[PDB]
Design a protein around this ligand. Structure first.
Ligand SMILES: O=C(O)[C@]1(O)C[C@@H](O)[C@@H](O)[C@H](O)C1
Ligand SMILES: O=C(O)[C@]1(O)C[C@@H](O)[C@@H](O)[C@H](O)C1
Ligand SMILES: O=C(O)[C@]1(O)C[C@@H](O)[C@@H](O)[C@H](O)C1
Ligand SMILES: O=C(O)[C@]1(O)C[C@@H](O)[C@H](O)[C@H](O)C1
Lengths: 280, 293, 304, 305
């Protein structure tokens, strides 16, 4: 009585994570870009830093050449606007060749001094690229999932919980809360072997406002959200996603979807000015 | 700079899945009980069998002995009401001793002729006991997750996608629509090794009514769900979870001839064992009644 | 094109991890204590603290486990009867590797759980991870005794080990083997989870020569006198094991008597013997006889 | 009752062989070098090529920069003496994870520079990390009688050399050559680092190395007695003389070269290969040029008698 893998057409072994960490080791320069950017994003998130975190980047990468050019352009503005903004590049995408292409781009961009951001879709793929990640988002459809909250509880970067696909703010405040506590999930070791991951908790989680039924970047949503975070005994630290379905010091970060460029300069220069205006 | 496992307190290697299947191989009775039960649930779901899948069991297992005595009791009712209710037991609970204790119980129960049911919450644990699984539920907090639908696409058992914690039914209709297609998710091999899982599609995916802001077992919800499934081009095979936010009707719906209700979910010894006999006997009578229309 | 890899490999198949073998066939408290007490007892005999002789006796090859488990029951009674004179351990040598490993463990678990200690041979660095927890003694054959890799396997083996003389009668390869094993080494093998690993060793002081014949036999009082002088000149404890079979015999029964006379004369250097015995290679009747004979030769040694 | 790992101080996981082939992927240049060399060595071992195989290299590699300079000089000699000699460099090493990285990066660079590499197979696991870069390999005198070794040779993608015993025993190698030609089985690790069963198809390209013993074994008389030894056994009389080790115990390895060069000139087609231990600063670089040029001239002379 064949009862196993009845609907599995194929199970091919995946290169162990250590094989991507050996083929593509973090340069000291990548390591510091990742390490400084995390601490930066932390200082901004708790209010220690008056600058704004800016996750901007292509909607999706289809060409690594095209992306390395965007990055070159972005790094200039990253440091040109360094005292008003914290610019991070958003890098969304054979799985083995895919994992190699993914890692090489994140390492090259962090070695060029540009910190990288993306989405933590599952609990196994972080073991391959999170050493080069300074920030990540949990999607609207996986915010209420418990494994995605446990995942963040052990992610080494700050984490953005998006709101519900209807516009629910409670699953995010409950997620942010959950991530702050130790947890246990199941994934693999850097050798690729089924393992138990015991977390210590991530205090650097915050909500993303990405829309829903109708947009929610309105001051009144942000006021309702900020009162929602305060009641739950959380730092009112808010990020607004300008894309997808979308002196106030409770807005600590924005999110932008930008391809190859003119309005990107305009928007970054515009938010720069509003950050400067807030210090007064 | 230390940028790795900064928020990891420990990463301990887990027994490979093959080591649970070696320590506890399926008997031919388990093997048979799993295969027959899964085929039965399919026929009941797609309207070839007029019986009703009853997923009943304790809300939580704290003792293995107590659960083995419940299984013995429920097996007797399963054999009696076999021409009205395909009865399946709900089995919800060191991870290695937890995997050992969970596998042994599911084998023992299937080797006793009682098919077992559970909840698939991750993409790794299935590899340890799915061979002993005849049905499974996908929770309300993981029904819009693409990973949990792609898991169901490659699950060898019939799958139940619960509604949302509010009452959303589309996540599940979309879930059922998704599972029916080939997908790909990352999991481990039976040797415990990171892998690419290419699926084929599970056509045996269905909706569960677990309640929400307000219970949804009423005939109209069932009619709505039927119409919502009908509009998505999906068979209106519906299951109502008498428990959860639907407890904090169905029988007469069936007595009157609702063929859409094809399954139920009960949380018993959470009722005690006497009401369990009553409710199974009640629904048995309702399925008998449904055939005379 | 230009296939440069696995050109002469017909198939590579993943073998169960050692953990799947120790999980399906876990040691029992009775099996654990038999291995522990035999390994301690074999050590005390090899060092002179025990006057008893080690007796590694068992079938030439195991094709049937019922036949092996019946020999196990018979041999156990003789182990219990001659316990004050002999340390009897069964030789479990067999000819799907995955099933062969399942069959081998279940056999060693059953025999050690019945209270009979098991002895075998180490031919590889990987197979020990599946069955050595049930091994109270083991051997390094004459064709692997000059191989450092095995000397490093013996350096990290939890059982006392026996190195065999050259297939030509060469003693140096094993006096050198014992010296190497006494040291900490490092050999590549797998974990209990089946993963390529580096094994760091502490050294095994419980390694000893097995006389098994090379060109002509080597069991006479003269070969032992000169093998013992060779261990003494090299600073090694003079503990010797004579295999009555293989080359020393072609008669196991004639070698038994020559060795029994040596023990009766007072040779405390012979601390162990090896016999190849089946039930239906001597038979059960001659096994009782050789065992009862060596027991009386140990009792005689005590008095001289 | 601690019955496990009582004599094990530490067991650490070694990198999967795949982490080494990913970080140090073979180049199309390394691949063609290994491929054409394994095939050139085979044609010389069976008489299809009148050239001689030369396994020459340092005794011990403690510096890659010193080896890479030796590789550069040697390659020019390989290209100059190509019509008379199949020159291959011997790469023998004295954190195993770092030593794996150093070993493979070196064998990759040298095969990428077009110089085929030659080493020794000590165990059944290490191969999986660098054998894709080996054009020849050896089994030493202390493991030639070992089944596990002859089963690994049965499934090696390169021609293999079995050394005689440390007493000078030829049979074990005639028995080693025989066994290796048969299909066998051994337990090793996959390219993913996992416990495995390796089924072999057998290796016809295996031969004897005369490395020494109680006294040397390179005289015309030993080769004659060794070649008759192989003939009886029904085996291609294809012999390899190791000038070093116990055949020369520098100044003697050069006497062994003249002794051997004289037998080849005579016409001994049964000598298909030599082994020389050479360093820069073990003979020096100047003697290496000389001995390669010597053996080249003897091979040239062999074609005329
Ligand atoms: O490949 C997997 O991860 C599975 O989900 C688990 C396995 O045990 C089977 O029963 C499933 O059909 C597939
Ligand atoms: O499978 C092995 O263990 C090998 O030894 C690995 C590598 O050396 C290949 O080239 C051999 O053909 C086989
Ligand atoms: O189990 C042991 O005692 C071992 O000695 C442990 C380790 O050394 C393994 O590699 C050996 O093969 C067996
Ligand atoms: O277990 C994991 O998935 C991680 O690899 C652990 C975490 O601490 C890392 O730094 C990565 O952010 C994710």
């Amino acid at each position: 009585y064949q009862n196993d893998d009845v609907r599995v057409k194929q199970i091919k072994e995946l290169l162990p994570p250590i094989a991507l960490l050996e083929k593509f080791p973090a340069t000291d320069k990548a390591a510091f870009t990742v390490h400084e950017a995390r601490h930066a994003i932390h200082n901004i998130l708790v209010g220690k830093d008056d600058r704004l975190v800016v996750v901007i980047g292509p909607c999706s990468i289809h060409d690594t050449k095209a992306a390395l050019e965007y990055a070159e352009r972005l790094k200039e503005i990253r440091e040109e606007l360094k005292d008003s903004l914290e610019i991070v590049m958003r890098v969304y995408f054979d799985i083995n060749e895919g994992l190699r292409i993914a890692r090489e781009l994140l390492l090259t961009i962090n070695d060029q001094g540009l910190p990288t951001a993306g989405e933590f879709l599952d609990v196994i793929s972080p073991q391959y690229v999170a050493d080069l990640m300074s920030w990540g988002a949990i999607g609207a459809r996986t915010t209420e999932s418990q494994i995605h909250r446990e995942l963040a509880s052990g992610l080494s970067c700050p984490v953005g919980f998006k709101n519900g696909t209807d516009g629910t703010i409670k699953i995010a405040i409950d997620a942010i809360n959950s991530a702050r506590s130790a947890h246990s999930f199941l994934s693999v070791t850097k050798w690729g072997h089924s393992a138990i991951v015991n977390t210590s908790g991530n205090p650097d989680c915050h909500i993303i406002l990405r829309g829903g039924k109708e947009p929610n970047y309105s001051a009144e949503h942000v006021k309702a959200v900020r009162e929602g975070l305060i009641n739950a005994g959380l730092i009112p630290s808010i990020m607004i996603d300008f894309s997808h379905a979308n002196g106030d010091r409770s807005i600590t970060g924005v999110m932008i979807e930008s391809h190859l460029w003119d309005d990107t300069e305009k928007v970054l220069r515009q938010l720069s000015e509003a950050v400067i205006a807030r210090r007064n």
